[PDB]
């Protein structure tokens, strides 16, 4: 499952999403959207089940990218949460939350959702 | 906002969100859940932007819980979203996916949503 | 439960959620935000759960704004989607997607989520 | 847009949407799911924009169903919200909020969500 998990993805939208899995269930790496207010990699941080159910269940994970990095700042952040399926079209399917920082008035059109589907391939 | 960061907080179903904040954007501590199949303490690890816009917005950040530890598996991971506001009644407010691993037929139902307001007290 | 939603309510925004419950499930009646790209009244649709597990449950319940009337067009709809829960307290909690018409490149970004809680005062 | 959302349409999953959509922006219909704790046919009620942006955007739409009927009671309300495109391969492309009564302790859990795409075939 740290075999599997570790590597380079790509999304529906052509994002890059790099990533390490730590034994110990960490999930450190690198994003790059193809999309919105950014460029360039981002830091990214996250967490997997590393002791999965081995009944042939996915794996639940989950991370966040903050939007600043050295070329922008979005002031803005989105978490993923899904889980990874192994196999020979292997799968990170999630969900996302992006919020973006704000005055309290429009606070209630604070936060996006969408999915994502990763793949190891395109 | 790194200072007002770090700290300990509790969200309305007196859960215990501990905390810092690095300076690099890095959110590192311990969560403890109230509720679910949860106990004691575990790992988390997530983001924030470390150079908020001034013009009294809040902090976007977002982390996630593998909930994983010596006690229990329940296979499964919450990633918050959401904002830092500061001042007196400093505040969090996210909303939250959490995802559980499971098979293909029920995939469908595989991730719940809620939100939590975390405060400095109770 | 037909006698306990129908009614005048209020969410935490000052907006104005006025609504029937029919006996067979049908919520009608109109809805008036505080907030966003929106004045006066605009019609909504929805279901109810018309028996309700008796073991003192809330009741599970939905509704659709499309955001047109004879003011204006924000070309976008809500849907929220939640449990009513009666007693001298009562209340309506909801969470809500606001899906926007989009062309396709920004399609990604098409929805916000949040939560509204509804009560009989206020 | 009228003549392109009445009709028959399917997801991802085989589940069956049949709906009228009416001039006012009203959407009435019936819901059958492939999947969960239902069986046969459900009403449906929803909204969308019927004067949509020209600039050919979607049409932003969305609609209810409360898992009752004459065969089961699931105790639950889906909502989907979303967007209508036409063309030659049309689409509903939706997110979905499932809340399902509940006591006030497990009410933290109360709500699934997911994403649903609907063809005119298949
Ligand atoms: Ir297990
Ligand atoms: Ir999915
Ligand atoms: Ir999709
Ligand atoms: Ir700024
Ligand atoms: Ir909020
Ligand atoms: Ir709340
Ligand atoms: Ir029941
Ligand atoms: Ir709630
Ligand atoms: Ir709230
Ligand atoms: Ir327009
Ligand atoms: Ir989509
Ligand atoms: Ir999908």
């Given at each position: 499952?740290?075999?599997?998990?570790?590597?380079?993805?790509?999304?529906?939208?052509?994002?890059?999403?790099?990533?390490?899995?730590?034994?110990?269930?960490?999930?450190?790496?690198?994003?790059?959207?193809?999309?919105?207010?950014?460029?360039?990699?981002?830091?990214?941080?996250?967490?997997?089940?590393?002791?999965?159910?081995?009944?042939?269940?996915?794996?639940?994970?989950?991370?966040?990218?903050?939007?600043?990095?050295?070329?922008?700042?979005?002031?803005?952040?989105?978490?993923?949460?899904?889980?990874?399926?192994?196999?020979?079209?292997?799968?990170?399917?999630?969900?996302?939350?992006?919020?973006?920082?704000?005055?309290?008035?429009?606070?209630?059109?604070?936060?996006?959702?969408?999915?994502?589907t990763f793949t190891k391939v395109?």
């Amino acid at each position: 499952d740290e075999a599997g998990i570790t590597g380079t993805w790509y999304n529906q939208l052509g994002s890059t999403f790099i990533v390490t899995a730590g034994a110990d269930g960490a999930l450190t790496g690198t994003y790059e959207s193809a999309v919105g207010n950014a460029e360039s990699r981002y830091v990214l941080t996250g967490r997997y089940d590393s002791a999965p159910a081995t009944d042939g269940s996915g794996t639940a994970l989950g991370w966040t990218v903050a939007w600043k990095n050295n070329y922008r700042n979005a002031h803005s952040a989105t978490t993923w949460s899904g889980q990874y399926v192994g196999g020979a079209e292997a799968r990170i399917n999630t969900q996302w939350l992006l919020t973006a920082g704000t005055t309290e008035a429009p606070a209630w059109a604070m936060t996006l959702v969408g999915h994502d589907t990763f793949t190891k391939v395109k």
